[PDB]
Amino acid sequence: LSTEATAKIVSEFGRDANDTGSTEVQVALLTAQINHLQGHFAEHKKDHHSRRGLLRMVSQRRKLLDYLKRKDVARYTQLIERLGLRR
Amino acid sequence: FCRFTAEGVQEIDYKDIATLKNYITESGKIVPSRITGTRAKYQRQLARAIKRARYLSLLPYTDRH
Amino acid sequence: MRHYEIVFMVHPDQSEQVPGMIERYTAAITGAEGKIHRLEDWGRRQLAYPINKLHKAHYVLMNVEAPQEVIDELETTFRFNDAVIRSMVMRTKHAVTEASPMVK
Amino acid sequence: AVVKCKPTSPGRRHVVKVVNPELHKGKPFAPLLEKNSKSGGRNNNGRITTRHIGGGHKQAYRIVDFKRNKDGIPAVVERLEYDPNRSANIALVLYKDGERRYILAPKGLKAGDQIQSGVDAAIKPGNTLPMRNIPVGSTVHNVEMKPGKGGQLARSAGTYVQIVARDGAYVTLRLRSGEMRKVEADCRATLGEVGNAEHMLRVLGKAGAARWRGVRPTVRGTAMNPVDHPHGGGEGRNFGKHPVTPWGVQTKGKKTRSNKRTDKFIVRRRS
Amino acid sequence: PVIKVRENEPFDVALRRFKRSCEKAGVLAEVRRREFYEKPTTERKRAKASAVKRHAKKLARENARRTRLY
Amino acid sequence: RKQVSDGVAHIHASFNNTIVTITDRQGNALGWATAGGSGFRGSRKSTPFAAQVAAERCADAVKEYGIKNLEVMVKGPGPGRESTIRALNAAGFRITNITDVTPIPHNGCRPPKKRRV
RNA sequence: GCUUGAGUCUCGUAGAGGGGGGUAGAAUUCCAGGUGUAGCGGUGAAAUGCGUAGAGAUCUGGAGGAAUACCGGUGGCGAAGGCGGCCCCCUGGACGAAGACUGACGCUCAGGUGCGAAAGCGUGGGGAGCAAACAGGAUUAGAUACCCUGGUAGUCCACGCCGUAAACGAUGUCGACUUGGAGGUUGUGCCCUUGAGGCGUGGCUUCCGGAGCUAACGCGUUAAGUCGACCGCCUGGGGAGUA
RNA sequence: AGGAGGUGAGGUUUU
Ligand SMILES: [Mg+2]
Ligand SMILES: [Mg+2]
Ligand SMILES: [Mg+2]
Ligand SMILES: [Mg+2]
Ligand SMILES: [Mg+2]
Ligand SMILES: [Mg+2]
Ligand SMILES: [Mg+2]
Ligand SMILES: [Mg+2]
Ligand SMILES: [Mg+2]
Ligand SMILES: [Mg+2]
Ligand SMILES: [Mg+2]
Ligand SMILES: [Mg+2]
Ligand SMILES: [Mg+2]
Ligand SMILES: [Mg+2]
Ligand SMILES: [Mg+2]
Ligand SMILES: [Mg+2]
Ligand SMILES: [Mg+2]
Ligand SMILES: [Mg+2]
Ligand SMILES: [Mg+2]
Ligand SMILES: [Mg+2]
Ligand SMILES: [Mg+2]
Ligand SMILES: [Mg+2]
Ligand SMILES: [Mg+2]
Ligand SMILES: [Mg+2]
Ligand SMILES: [Mg+2]
Ligand SMILES: [Mg+2]
Ligand SMILES: [Mg+2]
Ligand SMILES: [Mg+2]
Ligand SMILES: [Mg+2]
Known part of the structure; x- marks a missing residue:
């Protein structure tokens, strides 16, 4: 992912624009990467070697979302509403 | 008995024919690293540059043509 | 931007238009807001193996800071042009302006 | 685009259709339309000359430009249409001046693309120029045997002809049937497949x-x-x-x- | 392996130089390899067997010098 | 009957035969000889002696062309690789160049399978 | 509540990692020709076969397919299967020195899902070489084989199906600890680098061996040693991984 | 002592 894009996401989701390790920041980065690779996997359908990384990112995002939902539901709902997710 | 390590170079350029002709033989092949004492990290770059030079006709493939 | 290096050969009979080719290419690059860091014409030199039944060709080397689209456009132009024998483009990590070890 | 039908009744179990959603679900161009009456394999003497021909569905002849003599003027494609008179489909093309024509639709053509005829045109699918400027190894269609007569070769739905050699004023081709042929180098040929x-x-x-x-x-x-x-x-x-x-x-x-x-x-x- | 004789150069010397150049280039080995088809299965097994035999023989030669037999 | 001095000797050797061809520099062959045709047949044509006999016969056949300086182009892993050149040198020819033109492909085509004798 | 597990970011490294698109050469085959004649090829020895209708040999031009000689190395990458000419685009992963942040977010996994050598199937192409089936010639008491002469499906491409291998390290995944020696590869921190040098710190990997374990062979800091969590599997050989 | 090139009845059963 682009360094400028990562910096923009960190500034948008974090507090001091330097934590860059919060659950919301990680989920946003994973979602952005998945959405960017959506167009890559819509053409190269025989790229399972890179699709495994996408699946790993999906699993990591799901685990982070479950942890956020278990810890603070208020932040989880706001994050999913902002990112357009459904669960 | 390596030479690029002593020279402290970072990359290899295919345009250095004066030194590519030393690492290639008369038949046009690339000698193994065990004869010249070359390190593998620079040998891979040497082979990659020699192939590009052969593509660009700076160096030949064999002595037939 | 992204650093590229382009080395292309041209027929000896068409060695009077190498400056025109260079001018057109650099005009396109400047219109695309690219940068040129090195430009050399090696001359009508001998080849290692014959290509299309000839033994001499004139080489041109150019290091560019051109974007992606114009590089592909120049590749298509080289492919369409019959005067140029072949061309090689390589994505370089850093632009270099040191003189070629064969310009001497 | 290739869809098999469901076996809801005897007669659809083995039916396969080619559905193209990019065609024009409307009416063709009346100024280019004209009449085309069926005969049934019978010549002017009224006797059957070619068998197995007769009946069918009423059709109309969409005139199509096989010469592409509008050199220099660029043009824009508008829409694709289905032609009952040939296997391939037609593309409506509007020139800058305002003239509308029907051309054969290549593989890589969509509504909104730009085409240009003439010698000075660039090498992109749909363009027409003499083979003296076309490079070697390219695939073309609507090849003309004589200059100015009109495209005759590779006019089917998915046919193409390769350009293998060009000596003097003659160009060597490789047709869809694998046969080689020498054609005058001044004959125009549309680029790309169909x-x-x-x-x-x-x-x-x-x-x-x-x-x-x-x-x-x-x-x-x-x-x-x-x-x-x-x-x-x-x-x-x-x-x-x-x-x-x-x-x-x-x-x-x-x-x-x-x-x-x-x-x-x-x-x-x-x- | 273009071998060109020189002025007043004998024939046996030129023939021996040509043979040595051919042996160094290694064309007989290549043509003998290409006479038949070696499966990747066989090539890997042969390479590994040769490497382990070389390593074992060098180790034995090095370690057999510490004991006498006379 | 034409007179040419600078000649070429192409040698095509194998594990079963050896063919010698005397030609010009442009490729137009002048004469040829083979071990199988030079009396020896079967297992007797694989010996280098048969190759040198064939070379001598080829030299005697091309002597009418009047060739003085000769180059050699060898191709094929055969025992006659040296015997043919020795015979050519002993036949009074002048060996001005020796070259090997053995074709070794760059893993192009699959070779035939291995023999299970 | 905490950072020691895990994870994220800044800076770089190597890599036949994956997909798509192009390009270059060697070589085999074929075609059109030039020189030139009696053999070529093959086998243990022969023969079928190819050849005076000019073969095979040598030169030029062209056509098309597949794979990229050396480098290439118990070398590298990938979860496995598996990946090798060169160039471009997209993309995954690992590691290394400094830093910044969340504060167990951690491990395993029945069912489930995905990938998955080669062979095989369908659709549409392509088909140079090799080659099951097949035909002929040989050997043999017989040879539906081993050898030779030809050669189809296949091998290749695009989309799907099958989901099988001695798919092996015959060793399930993750974690903590326990004497070592030779290297290889890939980074980094210092010391007059004072020329390829010396010391230390990480990752992966090859070999030999100590205690220990094992029926033995052998494993042996990458365990088959010392322990925890989870899953899968076996309970005599045949029948049978069959009905 | 290190590296490279090959290399064996062509087949011939049972007890
Ligand atoms: Mg009307
Ligand atoms: Mg009519
Ligand atoms: Mg009647
Ligand atoms: Mg009748
Ligand atoms: Mg009919
Ligand atoms: Mg009856
Ligand atoms: Mg019928
Ligand atoms: Mg009746
Ligand atoms: Mg009709
Ligand atoms: Mg054979
Ligand atoms: Mg790769
Ligand atoms: Mg990367
Ligand atoms: Mg399961
Ligand atoms: Mg297969
Ligand atoms: Mg198939
Ligand atoms: Mg066979
Ligand atoms: Mg009857
Ligand atoms: Mg039979
Ligand atoms: Mg199984
Ligand atoms: Mg294994
Ligand atoms: Mg098992
Ligand atoms: Mg797991
Ligand atoms: Mg462990
Ligand atoms: Mg590994
Ligand atoms: Mg051990
Ligand atoms: Mg045990
Ligand atoms: Mg039982
Ligand atoms: Mg069963
Ligand atoms: Mg019996």
């Missing part, structure tokens, strides 16, 4: 889809009588003779070409 390359995957599933196009049933010679066909006769099934067309000429492997003014142009027969 659109409906998936037209050969379509099947009919019933005799109705074949008779809708004007193909009458075919009767084999063995089922006929010796008067009607040489294969007629026999208490049961008998074919004790070499296969022969109804007019005495053998068909299995016998050559039927007797042209001598085109052997100079022909270089290698198809195999």
Whole structure:
């Protein structure tokens, strides 16, 4: 992912624009990467070697979302509403 | 008995024919690293540059043509 | 931007238009807001193996800071042009302006 | 685009359709439309000359520019349409001045693309220019045997012709049948393949889809009588003779070409 | 392996130089390899067997010098 | 009957035969000889002696062309690789160049399978 | 509540990692020709076969397919299967020195899902070489084989299906600890680098061996040693991984 | 002592 894009996401989701390790920041980065690779996997359908990384990112995002939902539901709902997710 | 390590170079350029002709033989092949004492990290770059030079006709493939 | 290096050969009979080719290419690059860091014409030199039944060709080397689209456009132009024998483009990590070890 | 139908009734189990959603679901261009009446294989004397032809569905002849003589003027494609008179589809093309024409639709063409004819045009699919400027190894269609006459070669749904060599004023081609031929280098040729390359995957599933196009049933010679066909006769099934067309000429492997003014142009027969 | 004789150069010397150049280039080995088809299965097994035999023989030669036999 | 001085000797050797061809520099062959045709047949044509006999016969056949300086182009892993050149040198020819033109492909085509004798 | 597990970011490294698109050469085959004649090829020895209709040999031009000689190395990458000419685009993963942040977010996994050598199937192409099936010639008491002469499907491409291998390290995944020696590869921190040098710190990997374990062979800091969590599997050989 | 090139009845059963 682009360094400028990562910096923009960190500034948008974090507090001091330097934590860059919060659950919301990680989920946003994973979602952005998945959405960017959506167009890559819509053409190269025989790229399972890179699709495994996408699946790993999906699993990591799901685990982070479950942890956020278990810890603070208020932040989880706001994050999913902002990112357009459904669960 | 390596030479690029002593020279402290970072990359290899295919345009250095004066030194590519030393690492290639008369038949046009690339000698193994065990004869010249070359390190593998620079040998891979040497082979990659020699192939590009052969593509660009700076160096030949064999002595037939 | 992204650093590229382009080395292309041209027929000896068409060695009077190498400056025109260079001018057109650099005009396109400047219109695309690219940068040129090195430009050399090696001359009508001998080849290692014959290509299309000839033994001499004139080489041109150019290091560019051109974007992606114009590089592909120049590749298509080289492919369409019959005067140029072949061309090689390589994505370089850093632009270099040191003189070629064969310009001497 | 290739979709199999459901076996809801006998007659759709083996039916496969080629559905293209990019076509024009409307009416064609009336100024380019004209009348085309069916005959049925009968010439001016009223006797059948080509069998298995008769009936079908009423059609209209969409005129199409096979010459592409509008040199220099660029143009824009508007929409794709279905032509019952040929396997391929048609593209409506509007020039800058305002003239509208019908052209054959290449593979890589969509509504909104730009085409340009003439020698000065660039190398992109749909463009037309003489082969003297076309490079070697390219695939073309609407090849013309004589300059200015009009495209005649590779006008089908998915055919193309490769340009193998160009010596002097002649250009060597490789046709869709594998045959080589010499064509005058001044003959224009549209670039790229043709659109409906998936037209050969379509099947009919019933005799109705074949008779809708004007193909009458075919009767084999063995089922006929010796008067009607040489294969007629026999208490049961008998074919004790070499296969022969109804007019005495053998068909299995016998050559039927007797042209001598085109052997100079022909270089290698198809195999 | 273009071998060109020189002025007043004998024939046996030129023939021996040509043979040595051919042996160094290694064309007989290549043509003998290409006479048949070696499966990747066989090539890997042969390479590993040769490497382990070389390593074992060098180790034995090095370690057999510490004991006498006379 | 034409007179040419600078000649070429192409040698095509194998594990079963050896062919010698005397030609010009442009490729137009002048004469040829083979061990199988030079009396020896079967297992006797694989010996280098048969190759040198064939070379001598080829030299005697091309002597009418009047060739003085000769180059050699060898191709094929055969025992006659040296015997043919020795015979050519002993036949009074002048060996001005020796070259090997053995074709070794760059893993182009699959070779035939291995023999299970 | 905490950072020691895990994870994120800044800076770089190597890599036949994956997909798509192009390009270059060697070589085999074929075609059109030039020189030139009696053999070529093959086998243990022969023969079938190819050849005076000019073969095979040598030169030029062209056509098309597949794979990329050396480098290439118990070398590298990937979860496995598996990946090798060169160039471009997209993309995954690992590691290394400094830093910044969440504060167990951690491990395993029945069912389930995905990938998955080669062979095989369908659709549409292509088909240079090799080659099952097949034909002929040999050996043999017989040879439906081993050898030779030809050669189809296949091998290749695009989309799907099958989901099988001695798919092996015959060793399930993750974690903590326990004497070592030779190297290889890939980074980094210092010391007059004072020329390829010396010391230390990480990752992966090859070999030999100590205690220990094992029926033995052998494993042996990358365990088959010392322990925890989870899953899968076996309970005599045949029948049978069959009905 | 290190590296490279090959290399064996062509087949011939049972007890
Ligand atoms: Mg009207
Ligand atoms: Mg009519
Ligand atoms: Mg009919
Ligand atoms: Mg019709
Ligand atoms: Mg019919
Ligand atoms: Mg009647
Ligand atoms: Mg009759
Ligand atoms: Mg009756
Ligand atoms: Mg009957
Ligand atoms: Mg009968
Ligand atoms: Mg053989
Ligand atoms: Mg790769
Ligand atoms: Mg990367
Ligand atoms: Mg399961
Ligand atoms: Mg397969
Ligand atoms: Mg198939
Ligand atoms: Mg066979
Ligand atoms: Mg038989
Ligand atoms: Mg199994
Ligand atoms: Mg293994
Ligand atoms: Mg198992
Ligand atoms: Mg797991
Ligand atoms: Mg462990
Ligand atoms: Mg690994
Ligand atoms: Mg051990
Ligand atoms: Mg045990
Ligand atoms: Mg039991
Ligand atoms: Mg079963
Ligand atoms: Mg018995």
